[PDB]
Amino acid sequence: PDYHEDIHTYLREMEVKCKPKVGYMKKQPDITNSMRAILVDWLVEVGEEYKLQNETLHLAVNYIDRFLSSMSVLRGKLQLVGTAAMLLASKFEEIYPPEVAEFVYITDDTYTKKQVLRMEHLVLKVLTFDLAAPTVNQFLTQYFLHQQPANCKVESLAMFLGELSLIDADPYLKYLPSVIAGAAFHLALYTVTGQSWPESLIRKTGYTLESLKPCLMDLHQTYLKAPQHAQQSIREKYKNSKYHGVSLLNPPETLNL
Amino acid sequence: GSMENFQKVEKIGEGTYGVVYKARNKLTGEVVALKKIRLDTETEGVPSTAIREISLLKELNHPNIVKLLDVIHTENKLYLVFEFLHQDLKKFMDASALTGIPLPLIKSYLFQLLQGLAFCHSHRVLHRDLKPQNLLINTEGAIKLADFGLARAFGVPVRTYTHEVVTLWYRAPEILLGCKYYSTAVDIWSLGCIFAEMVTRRALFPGDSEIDQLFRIFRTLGTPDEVVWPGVTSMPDYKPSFPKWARQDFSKVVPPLDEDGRSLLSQMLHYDPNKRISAKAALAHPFFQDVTKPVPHL
Numbered sequence: 192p193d194y195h196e197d198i199h200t201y202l203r204e205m206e207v208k209c210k211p212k213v214g215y216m217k218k219q220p221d222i223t224n225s226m227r228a229i230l231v232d233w234l235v236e237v238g239e240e241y242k243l244q245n246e247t248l249h250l251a252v253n254y255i256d257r258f259l260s261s262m263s264v265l266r267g268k269l270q271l272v273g274t275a276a277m278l279l280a281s282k283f284e285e286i287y288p289p290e291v292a293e294f295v296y297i298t299d300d301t302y303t304k305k306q307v308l309r310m311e312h313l314v315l316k317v318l319t320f321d322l323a324a325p326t327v328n329q330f331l332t333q334y335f336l337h338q339q340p341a342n343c344k345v346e347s348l349a350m351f352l353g354e355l356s357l358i359d360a361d362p363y364l365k366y367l368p369s370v371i372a373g374a375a376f377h378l379a380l381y382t383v384t385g386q387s388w389p390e391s392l393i394r395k396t397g398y399t400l401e402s403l404k405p406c407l408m409d410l411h412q413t414y415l416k417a418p419q420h421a422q423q424s425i426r427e428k429y430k431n432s433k434y435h436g437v438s439l440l441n442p443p444e445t446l447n448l
Numbered sequence: 449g450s451m452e453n454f455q456k457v458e459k460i461g462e463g464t465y466g467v468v469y470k471a472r473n474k475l476t477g478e479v480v481a482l483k484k485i486r487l488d489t490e491t492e493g494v495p496s497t498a499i500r501e502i503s504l505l506k507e508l509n510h511p512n513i514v515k516l517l518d519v520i521h522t523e524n525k526l527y528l529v530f531e532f533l534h535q536d537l538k539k540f541m542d543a544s545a546l547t548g549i550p551l552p553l554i555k556s557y558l559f560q561l562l563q564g565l566a567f568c569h570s571h572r573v574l575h576r577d578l579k580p581q582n583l584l585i586n587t588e589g590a591i592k593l594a595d596f597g598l599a600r601a602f603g604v605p606v607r608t609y610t611h612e613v614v615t616l617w618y619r620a621p622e623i624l625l626g627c628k629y630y631s632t633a634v635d636i637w638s639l640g641c642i643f644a645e646m647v648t649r650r651a652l653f654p655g656d657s658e659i660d661q662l663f664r665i666f667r668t669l670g671t672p673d674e675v676v677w678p679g680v681t682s683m684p685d686y687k688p689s690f691p692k693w694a695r696q697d698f699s700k701v702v703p704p705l706d707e708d709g710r711s712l713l714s715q716m717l718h719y720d721p722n723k724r725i726s727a728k729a730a731l732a733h734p735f736f737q738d739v740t741k742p743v744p745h746l
């Protein structure tokens with residue numbers, strides 16, 4: 192574990208500072224949680240079409256939630272915010288980000304290339320360039336090293352659950368990425384192998400099933416209800432072999448906490 | 449407008465990014481280094497390199513990492529305001545070519561550089577371009593990492609990152625061999641090369657090409673095999689036709705060095721990245737027992 196503990200400790204400090212305002216949607220006169228779900232679901236699809244890292248998707252959503260925490264946006268411009276956030280996440284995170292034109296193309300010519308570039312700049316100003324945010328994905332990835340044994344179904348199912356949390360500002364905004372990761376991991380572990388949140392992760396994170404329970408109860412409900420959610424892109428993506436078809440698995444009916 | 453308080457003193461260089469000036473704040477007297485970055489306002493927008501450099505420097509706050517003081521936005525330009533440092537390690541080595549840098553100063557500089565690098569690594573940042581041109585010194589004995597243009601935030605565990613990284617002479621063999629994963633070890637390798645360079649007054653591995661660079665390393669450290677580097681023969685660009693050179697005795701590689709210095713150096717240049725020493729563990733090395741902070745003679 193070369194620098195693993197320092198890094199984990201540092202991201203635990205940063206997820207607190209890069210956290211969006213929990214209330215924010217109530218303060219937006221024109222947009223809702225239902226519109227934000229639509230947008231994130233669209234971003235999922237863009238990630239698939241351009242084969243972007245899942246990390247890129249998680250960063251983009253964090254940038255949008257922080258931007259909307261401080262700026263009032265009309266609904267006609269919401270997709271513009273998201274296009275610029277995804278472009279910035281790509282530039283930050285990808286080896287080969289797609290060119291700006293591809294981001295203009297993917298918005299069906301709703302917006303101009305100048306609009307996208309100007310929005311890029313405004314997003315940067317509003318976030319003051321603070322782009323290295325911890326995401327649910329960054330914690331999951333570390334939590335995966337405590338697997339006994341490593342299990343590719345558990346990993347993909349965890350990622351799927353984490354991704355589902357991105358869609359629903361209510362209730363997931365309330366929770367830190369480290370906690371959402373803990374819940375997703377445990378829920379995945381249990382669904383696949385009947386097993387539980389590792390003792391070694393209690394030591395690392397300081398979280399127990401007891402502390403994760405609130406997030407867990409929400410996440411389990413999200414999972415059981417996923418087939419009926421208006422947004423379906425995450426379920427579709429996670430049908431492919433790349434992800435071992437995990438969205439096709441049966442959620443457990445009970446948790447026995 | 450936003451730059452009205454800055455008086456340009458002189459140009460001090462450039463990069464692919466744009467121009468670097470020395471300037472003074474007309475109101476406070478503060479002398480600074482200004483980096484000017486052109487925005488591709490009809491094409492690509494703000495460049496990925498600047499985005500990474502700015503966000504990463506805003507996180508890293510350490511005595512051995514150059515200070516970003518401010519970021520000034522215009523519609524067409526971005527100005528980075530940095531603390532002004534006297535010169536870089538490259539120019540200091542040239543000034544020192546006849547005498548050599550005294551060993552207390554080499555020790556001090558390496559110590560500080562490792563402190564800065566440990567700080568980066570602890571904050572999940574890879575520098576990926578350590579070289580003497582990118583290390584800045586002041587007139588009091590400090591040295592600082594700079595040009596985070598090629599840096600990146602890494603994940604635990606890492607995934608595959610950009611292959612085209614680190615200037616050739618300072619580039620780790622795992623990169624040269626095309627390995628799928630690389631990690632903080634590549635910065636330590638760079639630092640090892642820079643350490644040897646300070647000592648012998650010439651680049652350790654001045655290759656003219658990728659294959660040449662690799663062979664210069666093999667000729668010095670011995671061609672690696674499965675016993676010193678488990679997995680080497682499985683790398684994407686490993687070739688069974690590689691000539692097999694015997695390792696040379698380190699007191700020939702770095703004559704002026706003591707047993708301790710040689711011990712440190714060999715651990716920084718170990719082939720297997722998973723065994724190559726970490727910056728943090730290097731801080732604890734006996735070589736550093738007696739470190740002081742001399743003033744260079746500029």
Ligand SMILES: Cc1c(-c2nc3nc(N)nc(OCC4CCCCC4)c3[nH]2)cccc1S(N)(=O)=O
Binds near residue numbers: 534539581
């Ligand atoms: C370096 C230098 C400087 C010099 N002082 C500097 N101070 C800061 N803070 N940044 C710099 O740029 C770092 C950046 C520039 C692009 C390449 C490396 C990263 C500086 N360059 C001022 C007079 C003379 C000299 S020199 N060449 O030693 O005579």
